[PDB]
Design a protein around this nucleic acid. Structure first.
Lengths: 479, 58, 173, 137, 445
RNA sequence: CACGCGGGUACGCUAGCCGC
RNA sequence: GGCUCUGUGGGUGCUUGGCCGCUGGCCAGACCUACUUCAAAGCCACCGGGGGUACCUACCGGUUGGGGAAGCCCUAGCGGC
């Protein structure tokens, strides 16, 4: 019939924007509760339906490339062919920085992709606006540099020196150094909480609140130096990856790991985790990489193999992933589809960047454009890959063209809605659920032959006599 | 401290209440029309003499 | 509770229709005074309903020399007949807001269904016409041909000269 | 200027007519992206601070020509389910905020009266005529 | 078939326009921490309303000399108040100019017990002297009354009809008596047939005309039908009731403020049980008044408190207090249903606001949308522990706090005594009588 | 209840019978 | 004709090729996603001085309710210490 499209529309919107199963109105016994819950179910149904109908006003289109003939394959496509076939405002972004004498470089974009920071190993830390081509800062620092990271804006950044971390302003003037964070080898900035989480080489993980300036919870990961660290963008829990070959999930409200996904036989070399929090791809020292469903904590498919222990892996805003191993990175497209209940293995990579003798230190996706920045020992190299990048951003959350007034107002609103670090769990939507023990105690204070042998075995050891045990002795004598 | 200690007054079941909230109110997650219709207040008081009702409406 | 209000200026007289009327208990409150200051929060209160300009400076001179003396003119009676809903006050009235008490009495005597509130007596309509006199250049600018400054200048000169009889015994230049 | 948040409502109101036109075979998806971009540019021009009656009339003429184009295309593709009522309602909305913003422009008042007389709206025409006579006596 | 996503800055500003275009994508992958960010915004909303909760607005004039023992608004106008003090002087105030009184007169000898406005423009006042009528709005000021009435015992309160020129005065002889102005002299005295105790308050029902409620010091409420001039029903409660009032949107609901520290919302058709019991006070409740929207209540108590209530709440939405306010005798709304007025025993008429953190005037759209968004968010997440403790914290004076701690101890002791007598007496095999059913002692006709 | 396109009784017009 | 400034190439250490998934290939690349038996041994791991300790965390010792690896025995069991 003609209403079949209507029922399909409602099923699709209840899948996507529904955020829950539905309230069962037939089991409600109260009359006023029944009509108010029917009113609420009508309002939530039209809410999801109007969001799905207003998903037509999205402006941009997702990029792609598809092979035409039967012999042509997508991984044999050259960057010169992409640059010839693509528009000029996005063919401008395929550059290459040639910085040779100051260590392998480490790239990190800001979370709108306006400014990128690249840090050499021997000290050369620079901060540039890579589309407009101007550099905001460049400074040399002397000693080694473990990791450089932007903070909430492109105003402040944070560099991990030989002992401490240092946070710097937009001009590069050093605001301060953090002395509690010694020998920091990895850093990750939670964006919605204002926490900066640092793994030392000793295995200690410190969460420092950036806004107010006090370290929230120093967790000591009891086993080994950590090899890698990433951050779930959906839970804000930290997937750190150890050297015995397990990845452990950490949160500032517990000193034990939340889960520990057992992984590759050697140490895991790199991790990456989806921005919807669905799946995690990890690459180990044993040459395999493998993906996990995170919402169920099981392995999705068999282990893919990489032909070298992959130094970095970073997955995009859409389904693409760049796994950078040895001296050339490969991009895979369909590793984890959200819609499929049982995942299938991908035969061929989506596209491969060339191996011409520059060992890849770190690959990163520019968060809203369809490019990929590889930081290697010869410097920085930005390549363009069409399928990646979220085509339609939201101007309220994060904006690639944010003016000065919009940046000021957004920083103040993010300060006002910074989340307390005790609001971190495996499921981030728990706020308002039942304390079941407290509800059972409230209802209690409102309404007011195989185990009874191990009972006596446990209570003969106290040796309190405790009249319930006298009743249990009489029961055992009767038995 | 972010869990709720007991059920609110009209609700009768844990599934009912924890599944009845379920959707964010804010403008980031819902459309503008939905946000207006969901944050309209129940009693809408305009300015003037609010005289008691003269004759039955229904 | 005001429904409409007259407002006479040198280019002509316009009557506004109030929607979301002013709070009368918090008239001396700082937030309501700031609302009466800002045009973005007073144009929500007033919406321009009708405008009647003069035909000539002679008609504007007759308009002042009737209104200041108190008596309403025939074209003001005409525009009120056109804009106000025709009633007699037996079961429903219309509240008009005017600036002068004698003009209030005469409009109420000409139209029995229109209850007039004078700005000299009622503080609500006083503050409301005060806000319209504040923002009177921007509330009319879509149909304000030219300005109001030279109109007020020439009309004050014509009114003062008609009151004084200046030209008949000033001759020395 | 809250013009983005102000024009969000008019775009979200015009969206389900575009959903019906996409689920029928009348406008293709690239053409509907073009309609979305043109209505968005028109709304962000209309709800701007410094605006003009010629800008309001350009938007009125575009919406009315879109209704005429969809009428020709609907008669060619032989559909009777699609109605012009939502387009006439949004054209009346454009004209009502037009005469709210610029009441002193008789060209826009006469264009409003011509539109209301042309799509068979006699009672609405009499009300618009009363408001126009009150503003320009 | 290569195509990558190209973003011009035309998607942020079209050239030639100052409008910053804000494209929005409502997909939930882009907006993480939905429930957590909304909890943080609700917590900010509670802390913001506790910061901007500033309810005291002003005080009408210099006040009275002795305390304000009666006051009455004009239900037709919007800024006409009057208040009669304890030294028998009445004043008519205009709420637009609160600097000085509009019209004052040394009315009576004793305190002014009741006071009201007529529907034309004139006002009436009771005393133990007898009731009087004045014209406070006249082109010469007249101190002398234009009518007086002494026969009918010692009068206690007044209540005027909604439409006509009828009014009922509650006397101390156990009767009310009803006058029609301009063609009645002594009025008609309606009484319960053998009734002796004084009728304290009287209130015309404004919705349903010709239904009159009254309380009396027999701890009883009585009704009256004016169409067939007789009493109707009489129920005896447990404690004395200070004041009856009706709901201006629901014709059948009434509220009695009673010496049980309590407000009882009753149904006039079924006096079996109370529809609601508001319990929050410390000393006796002196005055109760429904909002003109019919959904809220003010109660001025005999200790130093005003308590603002919703209609279905059963506990305080707000409490207002002040070191200068000595006792509270008469509280009533303005017809805006936004501001409340308080006639005290310090001789002061004070003007507070209900919705203490909500400022009046015209708001911009992104201002009133932020306020409505905060109110809806508190309606959802108001029961969580942090949000709950900050939204319930209010600073009470030391006497009221100490006496409500004593009242909690005494009520818990009485509940424990009753529960022990139930568990060890023969009442164990009965259903527990609900508290709204226990609110009424007997009902008779 | 009616709302698109045609030939009709009829136009410096669209009110009325049947279709596409 | 001269001073100054700038750019490129060579040199400023003793001469053995460009790249790769390197015993072989490629420099026009080619093939693309396999194969699998048994997670891991422990320790250390740099914050300036004196002081406070309500709360959180670490360490040590306990308390209620559950849980049972392993050790021991035999009336053999859905066992027992």
């Amino acid at each position: 019939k003609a209403e079949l499209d209507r029922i399909r529309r409602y099923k699709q919107a209840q899948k996507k924007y529904g955020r829950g199963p539905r309230v069962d109105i037939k089991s409600v016994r109260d009359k006023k509760l029944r009509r108010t819950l029917t009113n609420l179910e009508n309002k939530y149904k039209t809410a999801a339906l109007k969001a799905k109908e207003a998903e037509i006003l999205l402006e941009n289109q997702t990029g792609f490339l598809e092979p035409e003939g039967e012999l042509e394959r997508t991984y044999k496509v050259r960057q010169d062919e992409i640059v010839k076939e693509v528009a000029v405002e996005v063919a401008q972004k395929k550059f290459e920085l040639k910085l040779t004498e100051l260590g392998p470089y480490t790239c990190e974009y800001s979370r709108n992709g306006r400014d990128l920071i690249l840090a050499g190993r021997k000290g050369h830390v620079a901060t540039m606006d890579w589309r407009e081509g101007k550099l905001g800062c460049e400074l040399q620092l002397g000693e080694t540099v473990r990791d450089a990271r932007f903070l909430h804006n492109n105003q402040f950044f944070a560099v991990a020196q030989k002992k401490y971390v240092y946070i710097y302003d937009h001009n590069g003037v050093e605001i301060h150094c953090l002395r509690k964070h010694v020998e920091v080898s990895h850093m990750e900035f939670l964006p919605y909480h204002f926490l900066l989480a640092t793994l030392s080489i000793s295995g200690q993980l410190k969460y420092q609140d950036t806004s107010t300036g006090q370290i929230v919870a120093e967790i000591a990961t009891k086993h080994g130096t950590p090899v890698s660290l990433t951050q779930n963008p959906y839970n804000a829990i930290l997937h750190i990856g150890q050297q015995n070959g397990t990845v452990t999930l950490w949160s500032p409200n517990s000193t034990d790991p939340l889960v520990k996904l057992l992984a590759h036989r050697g140490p895991v070399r790199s991790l990456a985790v989806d921005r919807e929090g669905r799946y995690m791809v990890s690459t180990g020292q044993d040459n395999k990489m493998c993906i996990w469903d995170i919402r169920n904590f099981k392995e999705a498919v068999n282990s893919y193999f990489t032909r070298a222990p992959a130094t970095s892996v970073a997955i995009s805003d859409t389904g693409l992933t760049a796994v950078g191993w040895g001296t050339h990175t490969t991009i895979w497209k369909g590793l984890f589809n959200k819609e499929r209940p049982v995942q299938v293995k991908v035969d061929s990579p989506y596209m491969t960047w060339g191996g011409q003798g520059q060992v890849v230190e770190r690959v990163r996706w520019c968060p809203f454009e369809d490019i990929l920045g590889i930081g290697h020992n010869e410097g920085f190299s930005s390549i363009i890959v069409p399928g990646a990048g979220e085509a339609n951003y939201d101007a309220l959350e994060v904006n690639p063209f944010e003016t000065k007034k919009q940046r000021q107002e957004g920083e103040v609103k993010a300060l006002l809605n910074k989340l307390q670090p005790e609001m971190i769990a495996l499921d981030p939507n728990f706020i308002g659920n039942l304390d079941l023990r407290s509800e059972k105690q409230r209802q209690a204070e409102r309404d007011l032959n195989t185990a009874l042998k191990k009972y006596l075995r446990k209570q003969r050891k106290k040796n309190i006599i405790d009249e319930k045990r006298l009743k249990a002795e009489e029961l055992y004598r009767q038995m | 401290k972010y869990l709720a200690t007991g059920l609110p007054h009209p609700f009768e079941s844990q599934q009912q209440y924890e599944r009845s909230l379920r959707l964010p109110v804010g403008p980031e997650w819902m459309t503008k029309e939905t946000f207006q219709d969901a944050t309209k207040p129940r009693v809408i008081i305009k300015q003037g003499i609010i005289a008691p009702m003269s004759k039955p409406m229904y | 509770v005001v429904n409409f209000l007259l407002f006479e200026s040198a280019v002509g007289f316009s009557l506004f229709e109030v929607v979301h009327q002013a709070d009368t208990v918090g008239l001396e409150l700082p937030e309501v005074k700031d609302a009466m200051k800002t045009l973005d929060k007073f144009g929500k209160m007033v919406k321009l309903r009708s405008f009647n300009p003069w035909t000539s400076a002679a008609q504007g001179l007759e308009a002042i020399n009737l209104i200041s003396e108190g008596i309403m003119p025939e074209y003001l009676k005409s525009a009120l007949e056109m804009n106000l809903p025709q009633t007699s006050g037996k079961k429903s009235k219309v509240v008009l807001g005017v600036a002068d008490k004698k003009l209030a009495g005469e409009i109420t005597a000409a139209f029995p269904g229109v209850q007039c509130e004078a700005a000299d007596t009622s503080e609500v309509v006083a503050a409301l016409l005060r806000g319209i006199r504040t923002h009177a250049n921007k509330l009319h600018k879509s149909l304000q041909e030219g300005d109001i400054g030279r109109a007020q200048l020439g009309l004050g000169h014509a009114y003062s000269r008609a009151k004084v009889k200046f030209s008949v015994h000033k001759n020395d230049n | 200027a809250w013009v983005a948040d102000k024009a969000r409502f008019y775009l979200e109101r015009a969206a389900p007519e575009l959903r019906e036109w996409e689920e029928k075979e009348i406008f293709t998806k690239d053409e509907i992206r073009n309609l979305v971009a043109k209505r968005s540019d028109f709304e962000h021009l209309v709800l701007a601070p410094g605006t003009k009656p010629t800008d309001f009339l350009n938007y009125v003429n575009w919406e009315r020509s879109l209704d005429r184009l969809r009428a020709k295309r609907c008669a060619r593709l032989n559909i009777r389910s699609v109605t012009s009522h939502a387009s006439q309602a949004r054209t009346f909305g454009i004209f009502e905020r037009a005469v709210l913003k610029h009441p002193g422009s008789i060209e826009l008042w006469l264009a409003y009266l011509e539109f209301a007389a042309q799509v068979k709206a006699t009672k609405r025409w009499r009300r618009i005529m009363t408001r126009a006579l009150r503003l320009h006596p | 078939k290569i195509k990558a996503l190209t973003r011009s800055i035309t998607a942020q500003q079209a050239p030639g326009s100052d409008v910053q275009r804000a494209p929005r994508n409502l997909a939930p992958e882009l907006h993480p921490f939905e429930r957590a960010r909304e909890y943080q915004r609700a917590l900010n909303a509670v802390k913001l309303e506790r910061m901007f909760a500033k309810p005291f607005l002003g005080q009408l004039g210099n006040g009275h000399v002795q305390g304000v023992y009666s006051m009455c608004k004009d239900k037709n106008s919007l800024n006409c108040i009057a208040s009669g003090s304890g030294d028998g002087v009445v004043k008519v105030w205009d709420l637009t100019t609160r600097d000085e009184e509009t019209w004052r007169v040394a009315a009576h000898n004793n305190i002014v017990k009741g006071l009201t406005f007529t529907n034309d423009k004139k006002l009436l006042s009771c005393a133990t002297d007898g009731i009087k009528l004045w014209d406070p709005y006249a082109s010469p000021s007249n101190t002398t009354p234009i009518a007086t009435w002494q026969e009918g015992g010692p009068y206690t309160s007044l209540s005027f009809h909604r439409s006509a020129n009828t009014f009922a005065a509650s006397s101390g002889q156990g009767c009310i008596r009803i006058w029609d102005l301009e063609h009645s002299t002594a009025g008609q005295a309606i009484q319960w047939p053998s009734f002796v105790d004084t009728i304290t308050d009287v209130c015309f029902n404004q919705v349903e005309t010709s239904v009159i409620g009254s309380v009396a010091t027999d701890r009883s409420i009585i009704l009256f039908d004016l169409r067939t001039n007789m009493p109707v029903i009489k129920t005896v409660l447990h404690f004395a009731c200070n004041r009856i009032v009706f709901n201006p949107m629901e014709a059948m609901n009434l509220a009695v403020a009673s010496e049980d520290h309590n407000i009882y919302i009753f149904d006039a058709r079924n006096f079996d049980k109370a529809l609601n019991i508001q319990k929050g006070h410390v000393a006796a409740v002196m005055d109760v008044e429904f909002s003109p929207t019919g959904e809220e209540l003010v109660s001025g108590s005999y200790d130093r408190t005003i308590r603002l209530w919703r209609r279905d709440a059963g506990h305080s939405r707000d409490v207002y207090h002040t070191k200068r306010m000595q006792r509270v005798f008469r509280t009533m709304w303005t017809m805006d249903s936004k501001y409340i007025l308080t006639g005290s025993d310090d001789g002061n008429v004070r003007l507070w606001r209900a919705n203490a953190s909500e400022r009046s005037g015209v708001k911009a759209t992104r201002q009133r949308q932020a306020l409505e968004y905060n109110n809806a968010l508190l309606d959802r997440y108001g029961h969580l522990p942090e949000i709950r403790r900050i939204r319930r914290h209010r600073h009470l004076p030391k006497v009221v706090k100490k006496a409500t701690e004593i009242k909690r101890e005494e009520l818990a002791a009485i509940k424990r005594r009753e529960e022990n007598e139930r568990k060890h007496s023969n009442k164990k095999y009965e259903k527990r009588k609900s508290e709204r059913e226990k609110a009424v002692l007997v009902k008779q006709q």
